[PDB]
Design a protein around this ligand. Structure first.
Ligand SMILES: [Mg+2]
Ligand SMILES: [Mg+2]
Ligand SMILES: [Mg+2]
Ligand SMILES: [Mg+2]
Ligand SMILES: [Mg+2]
Ligand SMILES: [Mg+2]
Ligand SMILES: [Mg+2]
Ligand SMILES: [Mg+2]
Ligand SMILES: [Mg+2]
Ligand SMILES: [Mg+2]
Ligand SMILES: [Mg+2]
Ligand SMILES: [Mg+2]
Ligand SMILES: [Mg+2]
Ligand SMILES: [Mg+2]
Ligand SMILES: [Mg+2]
Ligand SMILES: [Mg+2]
Ligand SMILES: [Mg+2]
Ligand SMILES: [Mg+2]
Lengths: 128, 180, 125, 207, 86, 201, 103
RNA sequence: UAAAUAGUACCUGAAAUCGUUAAGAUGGAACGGAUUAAGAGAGAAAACAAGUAAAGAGGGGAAUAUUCUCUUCUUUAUUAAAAGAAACAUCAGUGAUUAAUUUAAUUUCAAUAAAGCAAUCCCCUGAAAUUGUUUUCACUUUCUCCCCGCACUAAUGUGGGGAAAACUGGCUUUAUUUCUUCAAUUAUUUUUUUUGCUGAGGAAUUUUAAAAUUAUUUGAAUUUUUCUUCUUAUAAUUUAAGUUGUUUCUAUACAGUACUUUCUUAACCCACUCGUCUUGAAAC
RNA sequence: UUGGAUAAGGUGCCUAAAUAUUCGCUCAUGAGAUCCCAUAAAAGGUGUUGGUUCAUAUGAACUAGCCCUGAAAAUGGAUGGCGCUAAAGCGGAUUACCGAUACCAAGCCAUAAAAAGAAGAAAAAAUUUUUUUUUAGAAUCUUUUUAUGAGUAGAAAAUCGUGGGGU
RNA sequence: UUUUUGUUUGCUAAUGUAAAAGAGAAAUUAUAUAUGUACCGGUACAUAAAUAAUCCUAUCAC
């Protein structure tokens, strides 16, 4: 609820939607970096090995990237921690391009900033 | 398949209802067909219409289903009548316009262009109230009546839209618009 | 532009000349950083002189290496030559500008014995 | 030797590691930790008896027939000298436009294929690479004009490998020539130089 | 540890396998699926068709119903308009 | 634009579009001889065009009109001016491009005998609906004090006869060639002939 | 016929450009009969040579050449971007370039 | 006189400014930045050749004056190799391209050639008698036929009125899918055609371990599979564990016209007088 | 810095990208043309384009699109210019493209923090032994990692240089 | 005009190309039609109608 409210406050400055499993996987593999260090001193490291992530998230019983992916897809018991561990996804711009960042997605004219609830995935694919 | 030609308006059946409350356990559901560019847009349109008509806002209702209606006979010409509500810079109006087309979606695409072109009415300001196929005995608009004529024939007075390959800017001979 | 030769990358062959050094003789080309409101160089308008910056710096590993791949060492005296008997590939001698012709010759001779390169052997030749 | 990862099946040729590199805090070490390089793999077009244009060399545009795929990767080619003027030549796949035409799809010539194959086999990779001594000799002439050229030519002739190559070429010519001559149009084609002209747009040409 | 490249997990097969141990099995399965020839698929189409009839009918009923509802609504609107005019 | 020198028959073309087409080509690097510039067309009515040109004429330099907008009013010169408008003519490259353009009224001493190309993107036939008012540039020029229009027309007429004469000869030659081909298709070989037939000739 | 073509003729236009920013790392080449993206794509790997003449001799000759790779097509109309070993000078901007058939 | 461009205005002798010569530019500024190019100068200390041999000119050091050995310059010739840049090739990274593809989902379809069903009929779609449902008549083709207008039409036909039928279309079937279809969109997968740029680093034990792969060996599994998976053991390999090779060229060169570099001109694009108080200065 | 892919905006030429596709509207005897923005109104129009409501294929009334009038200032003149009318205008839709110092990948510099640190042969070339390079351990230092980098007034640190002093 | 070699004291030998690689191409005219041919602008008959998506011209050495 809180999260939704927050989103609504920032609605015009972001797009979002419901990622879809494959997309999530892609994000994790091609674009997934991870915070590796003593708290508040992090270092953005790309995953590649599972030992990277099996350290910090060993306690919570998610070793390896697949577990993480699963957690992400279906907000599991250990979702939040996993999310925190993931360094924010530095994406490209979309290879075909946005319609117009000014206007909303649900505007009948071309735009972008809404809750494009499925179609986010396409955008992600474009800008992976 | 041709992607230069398409207009990506689809028709969506949306059904939704107000979230049940202790005081009103079994609320009414509402449906509509909505012409929208994608499913999310359709949903948003539905929500807007709910807000306009009933007391119902996205946050206190739930979408039960969103279906997407594909035309059953997408290669049969049909005569579509549409009834719009639109807003001009000066005020608000109803109008009924008719479009001969191959699908509801196509008609709506046509309609949006026409309203934009003829009235400067942008998509935001329009609300399609109903489209229905008019059997040709009840067609009132002369530009549609003509098409419905018996053994229809006409020449091809359009100019060639040559492919960009064979569009070359220097020509040997002065091309001809006559053709035949 | 960038001036690759091998592993030596130089990011900026052009010297940073003082702003307007071209316009007034009194303003020498030696870089001086324009303070002053409205400077345009300070403000970094397209088409004006560039400002030297730490981004331009050469990679820590190749920094003071000359095209030779050898650090220059200036030498006044035979005794000084001796530190580079154990470094005859990494360092190359330059003989100080003030060294006399006889002494220069001697130094050159020593360098040859050591196998150490002399970058100005030709002085007074 | 080959590796078969994700269905490719790549084929590995054993390479040598020539370049030494300076080690971090003590002494030098060979760069290539890798011992087996993946093989070239030529495009699905380069066959054993196709006619091909030579784009780049002194024999620029001459259409020559392909001879042997040469292990190293770059292949051998002949405009059976006495027909075309192109000798036994080594060339990269890239400096060739192989045509759709094939010598061993004509009804007359196709029956001489085994012999041709054998001849091709007889050729090696090392028979092209000129030895150092010869090169040195050639260089030595540079301390009048035409005389020098003549001397160079003589030197070239002298090389045993070169001689062998020449012999092979001659043999090939003997095998092939008469049939080619008999198919007159084909012979003419072989002789002639491929040219681009106005009308031959290049991107539309399926040749 | 010295940072080297960062290997493209999605493609770089070895890296992928390291990441996700199960992956190999999945990929094998996929390959197997790909393998099977078109005749079987064609045959299955008939079966699908056979199995689909009831579902198809249901779909028709649903969409027909929707259409009917729409028509009714339109009629009602027309009636209302008429009343207003009167 | 890979030819040495394109001759453009400016008749039936729409001034501005034609000019635009020319300009880009010029920039790219291509001599262009715009020929028969009396017959270029403008998309307004005649009167409207005249008015526009009148207005243009009116803008001289107050102080000293020797300098200031030169009102070149030969149709060719008008065309040239238009072309210039669409070039970066205050640079060196632009200047060069401008120089590369030659314009003529009617057709003279080489450009009778050169092939004359046409820019169909800028043809009045293809670019204005036939219920729209257009105007012949030559007439407009005449209205605004060019004078040498009738003379030009006469010259054109004279040239046309010559062209016609030439064309007859050309036609005859073509016919002869055809006849020869017909005769000499039989005298070749069979297979070769067949091949030729297969590819059109 | 003395000498053989074996390249597509081309015109080295400006550099890759904004309206008023230069980008001399890439040049734009027009290739003779290529009018579309698709057709341009055929040439994408091919090697391009800008050959030019000078007054003074150099390796004993008056002609020298700068080589390039043709990197990518350049939007809709068959122009291609070409990246050269050393940047081409703007003295070249109307000039002929030879786009070889190699690779 | 050592020296007079140390000649008593005399040490050095900067800049502004001016002269000579040369080179260059030159359409109402000039200069500048970024980027090459073209010139014109300089230059070899990376921008090839260590050593070995023959005999000259030197110098040293030791061993116990004269044996040994170490060298630097010349020279004749005598073999390297490395080095950089090209090109191709291979990987890896990161893109661009044009083909596709598996299993699902979502009222898709479309032919095939035999049967049939109804005729303003049917899939549908209208207009009339809170959803479903009943009935009403309205809707299709035509190169068919009839009557009037008698070539009247834009039409190689036609306006009106009326029939006919089921070639047309729709439905119902039974089979058929490479005669043609098997879309599109999503979900889930797999691969491919050309291809552009990049190659950081150099691991005295995380350039290992494992992953992966190949060739063997033991035991299972239901995805029955020349890429089926895991695992018992063993060797190698690279897809691991950031670019390696091959061949030319520079070149058998000592500076050349090549190479590096300075200046000088052009050219494309850009660029307003700095300092200053000022909300604000290119400022009239 | 190299490459990519975008943003705002554009894509007739100037000007890199569409004389793209697709549906309308508009002819102007001073058209129009894109936030801030560089002006226009009331009122009209048997101009044309749609409608709406009414009556008997015509007559009314309205209605809002574009266009026209209303619309006059002084140097000559400004959709930025040329020009554009089957638009290069106005309103849409569809693609594709071009397009920043922002984004992404990789490199290098610095800053910041983080890991972490008081003993050893590696290779090539020559012909089993010689030659060739290295054979590190400077804590404000070395190695590696990651992120970040605008800046006047101002603050700080590290550097650079001049005249003289002791060493 | 032709041939050869060259342009690798301020000078007294002297070079530059905004564009060579086949840089090939002469009806005219309308655009809701043209053009020829033959008669007297008219009539009859041919001809073009994705017109450079074409045609011409290259390689056969001495
Ligand atoms: Mg956009
Ligand atoms: Mg805003
Ligand atoms: Mg200020
Ligand atoms: Mg003295
Ligand atoms: Mg003096
Ligand atoms: Mg003194
Ligand atoms: Mg003095
Ligand atoms: Mg003057
Ligand atoms: Mg039937
Ligand atoms: Mg490296
Ligand atoms: Mg400027
Ligand atoms: Mg004030
Ligand atoms: Mg100021
Ligand atoms: Mg960039
Ligand atoms: Mg782009
Ligand atoms: Mg452009
Ligand atoms: Mg424009
Ligand atoms: Mg700062």
């Amino acid at each position: 609820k809180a999260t939704k409210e927050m989103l609504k406050i920032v609605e015009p400055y972001v797009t979002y939607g419901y990622p879809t499993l494959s997309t999530v996987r892609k994000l994790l593999y091609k674009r997934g970096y991870v915070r590796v260090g003593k708290v508040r001193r992090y270092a953005r490291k790309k995953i590649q090995d599972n030992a990277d992530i099996s350290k910090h998230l060993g306690k919570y019983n998610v070793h390896g990237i697949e577990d993480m992916v699963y957690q992400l897809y279906t907000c599991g018991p250990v979702f939040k921690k996993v999310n925190n561990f993931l360094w924010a996804f530095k994406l490209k711009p979309p290879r075909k391009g946005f319609k117009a960042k000014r206007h909303a997605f649900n505007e009948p004219r071309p735009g972008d900033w809404g809750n494009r609830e499925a179609h986010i995935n396409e955008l992600i694919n474009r800008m992976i | 398949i041709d992607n230069s030609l398409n207009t990506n308006i689809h028709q969506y059946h949306i059904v939704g209802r107000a979230i049940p409350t202790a005081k009103d356990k079994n609320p009414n559901v509402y449906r509509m067909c909505i012409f929208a560019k994608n499913d999310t847009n359709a949903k948003s349109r539905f929500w807007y219409f709910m807000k306009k008509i009933n007391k119902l806002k996205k946050s206190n209702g739930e979408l039960l289903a969103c279906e997407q209606i594909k035309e059953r006979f997408p290669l049969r010409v049909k005569n579509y009548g549409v009834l719009l509500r639109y807003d001009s810079r000066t005020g608000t109006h109803n109008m009924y316009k008719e479009f001969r087309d191959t699908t509801k979606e196509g008609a709506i695409a046509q309609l949006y262009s026409e309203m934009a072109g003829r009235h400067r009415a942008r998509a935001s300001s329009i609300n399609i109230i109903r489209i229905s196929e008019i059997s040709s005995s009840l067609v009132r608009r002369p530009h549609i009546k003509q098409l419905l004529k018996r053994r229809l024939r006409f020449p091809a007075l359009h100019l060639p839209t040559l492919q960009k390959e064979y569009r070359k800017k220097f020509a040997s001979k002065r091309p001809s618009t006559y053709r035949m | 532009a960038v001036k690759k030769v091998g592993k030596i990358i130089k990011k900026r062959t052009k010297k940073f000349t003082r702003f307007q050094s071209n316009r007034f003789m009194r303003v020498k080309p030696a870089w001086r950083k324009p303070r002053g409101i409205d400077c345009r160089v300070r403000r970094r308008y397209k088409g004006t002189n560039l400002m030297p910056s730490i981004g331009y710096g050469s990679n820590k590993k190749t920094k003071f290496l000359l095209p030779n791949n050898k650090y220059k060492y200036v030498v006044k005296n035979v005794k000084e030559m001796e530190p580079l008997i154990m470094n005859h590939t990494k360092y190359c001698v330059q003989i100080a500008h003030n060294v006399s012709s006889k002494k220069r010759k001697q130094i050159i001779e020593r360098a040859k014995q050591m196998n150490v390169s002399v970058i100005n052997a030709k002085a007074r030749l | 030797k080959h590796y078969n990862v994700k269905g490719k099946k790549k084929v590995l040729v054993p390479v040598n590691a020539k370049k030494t590199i300076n080690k971090k805090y003590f002494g030098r070490k060979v760069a290539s930790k890798k011992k087996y390089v993946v093989q070239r793999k030529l495009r699905k077009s380069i066959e054993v008896g196709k006619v091909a244009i030579i784009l780049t060399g002194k024999h620029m545009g001459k259409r020559c027939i392909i001879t042997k795929i040469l292990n190293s990767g770059l292949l051998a080619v002949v405009g059976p000298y006495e027909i075309n003027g192109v000798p036994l030549k080594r060339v990269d796949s890239r400096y060739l436009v192989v045509t759709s035409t094939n010598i061993f799809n004509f009804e007359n010539i196709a029956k001489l294929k085994d012999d041709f194959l054998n001849y091709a086999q007889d050729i090696d990779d090392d028979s092209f690479i000129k030895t150092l001594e010869i090169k040195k000799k050639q260089k030595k002439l540079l301390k009048f004009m035409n005389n020098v050229i003549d001397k160079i030519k003589e030197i070239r002739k002298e090389d045993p490998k070169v001689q062998k190559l020449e012999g092979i070429q001659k043999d090939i010519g003997s095998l092939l020539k008469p049939e080619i001559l008999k198919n007159k149009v084909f012979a003419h084609y072989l002789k002639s130089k491929f040219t681009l002209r106005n009308d031959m747009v290049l991107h539309k040409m399926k040749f | 540890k010295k940072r080297l490249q960062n290997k493209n997990s999605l493609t770089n097969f070895a890296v992928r396998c390291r990441l996700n141990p199960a992956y190999k099995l999945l990929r094998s399965l996929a390959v197997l699926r790909m393998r099977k020839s078109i005749l079987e698929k064609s045959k299955n189409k008939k079966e699908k068709r056979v199995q689909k009839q009831i579902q198809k009918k249901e779909l028709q009923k649903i969409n027909h119903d929707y259409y009917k509802g729409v028509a009714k609504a339109v009629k009602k609107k027309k009636k209302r308009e008429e009343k207003k005019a009167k | 634009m890979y030819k040495k020198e394109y001759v453009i028959d400016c008749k039936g073309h729409l001034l501005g579009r034609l000019a635009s087409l020319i300009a880009k080509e010029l920039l790219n690097g291509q001599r262009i001889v715009a020929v028969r510039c009396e017959d270029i067309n403008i998309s307004g009515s005649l009167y409207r065009n005249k008015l526009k040109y009148q207005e243009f004429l009116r803008l001289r330099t107050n102080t000293n009109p020797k300098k200031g907008p030169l009102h070149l009013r030969e149709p060719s010169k008008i065309l040239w001016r238009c072309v210039r408008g669409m070039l970066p003519h205050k640079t060196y490259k632009g200047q060069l491009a401008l120089k590369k353009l030659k314009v003529c009224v009617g057709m003279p001493y080489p450009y009778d005998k050169k092939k004359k190309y046409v820019l169909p993107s800028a043809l009045r036939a293809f670019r204005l609906k036939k219920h729209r008012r257009y105007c012949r540039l030559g007439t407009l020029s005449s209205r605004v004090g060019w004078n040498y229009d009738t003379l030009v027309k006469k010259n054109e007429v004279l040239r046309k006869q010559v062209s016609k004469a030439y064309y007859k000869k050309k036609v005859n030659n073509l016919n002869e060639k055809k006849e020869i081909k017909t005769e000499a298709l039989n005298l070749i070989n069979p297979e070769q002939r067949q091949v030729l037939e297969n590819f059109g000739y | 016929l003395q000498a053989v073509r074996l390249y597509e003729k081309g015109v080295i236009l400006g550099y890759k450009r904004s309206q008023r920013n230069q980008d001399p790392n890439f040049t734009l080449i027009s290739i003779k009969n290529v009018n579309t993206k698709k057709h341009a794509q055929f040439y994408v790997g091919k090697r391009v040579a800008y050959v030019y003449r000078t007054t003074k001799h150099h390796d004993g000759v008056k002609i020298k050449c700068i080589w390039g790779k043709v990197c990518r097509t350049h939007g809709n109309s068959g122009v291609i971007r070409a990246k050269f070993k050393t940047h081409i000078p703007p003295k070249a901007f109307g000039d002929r370039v030879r786009i070889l058939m190699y690779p």
